[PDB]
Amino acid sequence: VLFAKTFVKDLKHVPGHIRKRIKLIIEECQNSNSLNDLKLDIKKIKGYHNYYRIRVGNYSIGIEVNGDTIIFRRVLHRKSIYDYFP
Amino acid sequence: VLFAKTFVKDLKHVPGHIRKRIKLIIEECQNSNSLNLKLDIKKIKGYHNYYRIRVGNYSIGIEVNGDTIIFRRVLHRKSIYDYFP
Amino acid sequence: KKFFISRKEYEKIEEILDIGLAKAMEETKDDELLTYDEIKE
Amino acid sequence: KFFISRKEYEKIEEILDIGLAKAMEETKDDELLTYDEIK
C-alpha cells in the first residue's frame, strides 16, 4: 500500500469511528494486498482507468490501483465532494 | 420568441401535460415578450443571459439575447445530470 | 431500496441542475433558430 | 425529507464519483508514502 500526502490531511478531518474502520481496511490490505468486495462497498469510477471508491458511512475513500499497487489518495465526506467541480 | 433546432428534438420526449404548460408559456411571452407571470424562473449563476424555468420535473433553458427570448432546451431533471460536468 | 434526502441536499442538487442545463444550452450554440410557425411545421 | 429514488440517485452517485476522481487528480504529483511512514 502507498498513501498520497493529501490522504493524511484528509484523515485528520475524519471521525474516530470511521478512521477505525479505515484502519481495519488498511490492515487487511497489508495482510492480503487485496480489498474484499463482498465485505466492502467498492465501485470502479467511470471515465478513468484505475480509480475506485470505497464507501465508509458518509465518507468515500478514493483509491488508485496501479497494477498490483494500491494507492490511497483521498478520504472525503459526501458534502465535501460536492465542492470539487470547476 | 425563437427556438433552437435542438428544442424541437427535446420536445419529442416531453409528455402531453408538460407540453400544454410549455404552450401556455410560449403563448404568453409571444404577446408580452417577457418571462416575468406565475413562472418558476431563475437566472443561472455563472452564465451570461441564461435562465431556467421549472415545469414540474422538466426545465426549460432560455437565452435572452438583448430583446430576443430563445428557447434552447427542455429537459427532464434525470437527463440534465449527464451534461454536468 | 427507496431513497430520501434533506432540503440542503435538494438545494445543492438544484444548483447542479442549473449548471447541467446551462451546459445543455451551450451544446445548441450553432443551432438554427426557428420562429414559432417554423417549430410547428 | 424529499423523495428522490432511484435512477436519479444513481446519477447523483456518478457525479459524486467524478468529484472524488477530480479530488484524486489533485494528488497526481503527491509524494507517495509507505504504510510505515503514515501515522
SSE diagram, text form:
The complex is a heterotetramer, with 2 copies of chain A and 2 copies of chain C.
Chain A: E1 2-4, H1 5-12, H2 16-32, E2 42-44, E3 51-56, E4 59-66, E5 69-77, H3 78-81
Parallel strand pairs in A: 1-5
Antiparallel strand pairs in A: 2-3, 3-4, 4-5
Chain C: E1 4-5, H1 7-26, E2 33-34, H2 36-40
Keywords (chain A): Hydrolase, Nuclease, Toxin-antitoxin system
Organism (chain A): Methanocaldococcus jannaschii (strain ATCC 43067 / DSM 2661 / JAL-1 / JCM 10045 / NBRC 100440) (Methanococcus jannaschii)
GO molecular function (chain A): nuclease activity
Protein described:
The complex is a heterotetramer, with 2 copies of chain A and 2 copies of chain C. Chain A has 86 residues and is α+β, with helices and mostly antiparallel strands. Chain A has one domain: RelE-like (YaeB-like fold). Chain A has 3 helices and 5 strands. Chain A is globular and about 35 Å long. The N and C termini of chain A lie far apart (30 Å). In chain A, 28% of the residues are buried. Chain C has one domain: Single alpha-helices involved in coiled-coils or other helix-helix interfaces (Helix non-globular), CATH 6.10.250.2100. Helix content of chain C is 61%, strand content 10%. Chain C contains 2 helices and 2 strands; from the N terminus they run E-H-E-H. The radius of gyration of chain C is 17 Å and the shape is elongated. Chain C starts with a strand and ends with a helix. Chains in contact: A-D, B-C, B-D, C-D. At the B-D interface, loops of B face helix 1 of D. Chain C: This is Antitoxin RelB3.
